[PDB]
Amino acid sequence: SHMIKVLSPAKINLGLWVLGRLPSGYHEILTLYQEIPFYDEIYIREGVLRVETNIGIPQEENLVYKGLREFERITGIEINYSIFIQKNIPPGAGLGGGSSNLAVVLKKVNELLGSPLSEEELRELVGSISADAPFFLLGKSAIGRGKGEVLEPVETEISGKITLVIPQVSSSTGRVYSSLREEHFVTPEYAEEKIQRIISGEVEEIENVLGDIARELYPEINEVYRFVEYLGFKPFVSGSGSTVYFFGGASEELKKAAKMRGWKVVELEL
Numbered sequence: 001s002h003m004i005k006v007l008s009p010a011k012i013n014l015g016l017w018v019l020g021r022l023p024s025g026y027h028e029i030l031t032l033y034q035e036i037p038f039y040d041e042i043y044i045r046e047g048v049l050r051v052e053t054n055i056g057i058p059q060e061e062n063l064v065y066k067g068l069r070e071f072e073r074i075t076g077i078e079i080n081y082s083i084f085i086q087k088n089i090p091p092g093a094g095l096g097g098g099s100s101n102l103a104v105v106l107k108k109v110n111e112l113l114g115s116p117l118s119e120e121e122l123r124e125l126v127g128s129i130s131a132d133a134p135f136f137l138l139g140k141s142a143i144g145r146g147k148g149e150v151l152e153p154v155e156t157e158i159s160g161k162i163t164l165v166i167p168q169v170s171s172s173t174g175r176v177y178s179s180l181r182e183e184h185f186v187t188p189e190y191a192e193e194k195i196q197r198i199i200s201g202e203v204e205e206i207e208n209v210l211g212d213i214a215r216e217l218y219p220e221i222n223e224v225y226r227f228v229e230y231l232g233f234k235p236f237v238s239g240s241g242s243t244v245y246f247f248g249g250a251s252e253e254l255k256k257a258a259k260m261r262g263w264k265v266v267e268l269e270l
């Protein structure tokens with residue numbers, strides 16, 4: 001008690017471009033975030049600070065725990081909440097699950113404490129831990145510039161069936177960015193034209209160089225990719241992987257292949 005449930009949504013990258021290297025080790029990118037109706041369910045209860053999951057992430061490693069300790073640090077209040085996260089969104093899937101968890105929990109806890117932090121500061125608190133996290137404070141559809149944190153809400157003409165095929169391999173975002181060569185970079189002009197077209201519903205214009213690389217580093221991502229082609233759909237890769245998505249439904253043949261191979265198939269409707 002007094003236990004509440006809060007849904008924590010996933011996202012997909014509807015295209016991603018890398019502009020270049022930052023001194024910061026990180027990279028400047030352009031991307032289109034899309035919130036998807038695919039959720040972790042998070043149970044929040046009054047009690048000793050605790051962040052648990054159903055899949056065995058250490059408490060000290062969990063972004064939500066990191067975020068709630070920084071909440072105490074920055075604001076002074078001591079957080080008495082017991083967090084359990086049921087993880088439907090797999091880590092390493094390129095769907096921003098941990099960053100969603102972080103954003104939605106810290107926003108909720110903040111409200112529950114009479115709003116000590118402002119939407120600008122809360123954005124700063126979650127944003128420092130994950131460039132993808134601030135997106136989950138706004139949700140829906142947004143252009144992510146900078147490293148992803150500089151966000152511009154947009155209306156897309158994209159709707160209808162979307163299917164995720166998540167292999168049972170966890171892609172390391174860092175290992176994928178670290179395989180970039182100068183030949184993978186594009187000018188911001190090229191990418192801005194591309195994002196415009198995707199926004200207008202031209203899904204064929206989606207591309208993502210981190211998916212190209214993810215498919216070399218993790219052959220199973222490439223297996224899923226090739227299998228979606230075989231099914232007669234154009235496949236796309238979310239984030240740095242591992243998720244491959246397409247705009248259509250899941251056949252029994254895909255469902256068979258996934259069951260045998262250990263892939264998760266998520267059918268969503270945008």
Ligand SMILES: Nc1ccn([C@@H]2O[C@H](CNC(=O)Cc3nc4ccccc4[nH]3)[C@@H](O)[C@H]2O)c(=O)n1
Binds near residue numbers: 146170172
């Ligand atoms: N705009 C960005 C955003 C991120 N990055 C890279 O992502 C890295 C941050 N992301 C993660 O740590 C996500 C992640 N790491 C994993 C390792 C193993 C399995 C799953 C993982 N997810 C960061 O170190 C940086 O090199 C980057 O270069 N440019």
Ligand SMILES: [Br-]
Binds near residue numbers: 043045084
């Ligand atoms: Br619980």
Ligand SMILES: [Br-]
Binds near residue numbers: 181182
């Ligand atoms: Br390079």
Ligand SMILES: [Br-]
Binds near residue numbers: 219220221
């Ligand atoms: Br692999």
Ligand SMILES: [Br-]
């Ligand atoms: Br091949």
Ligand SMILES: [Br-]
Binds near residue numbers: 206211235238
């Ligand atoms: Br793609």
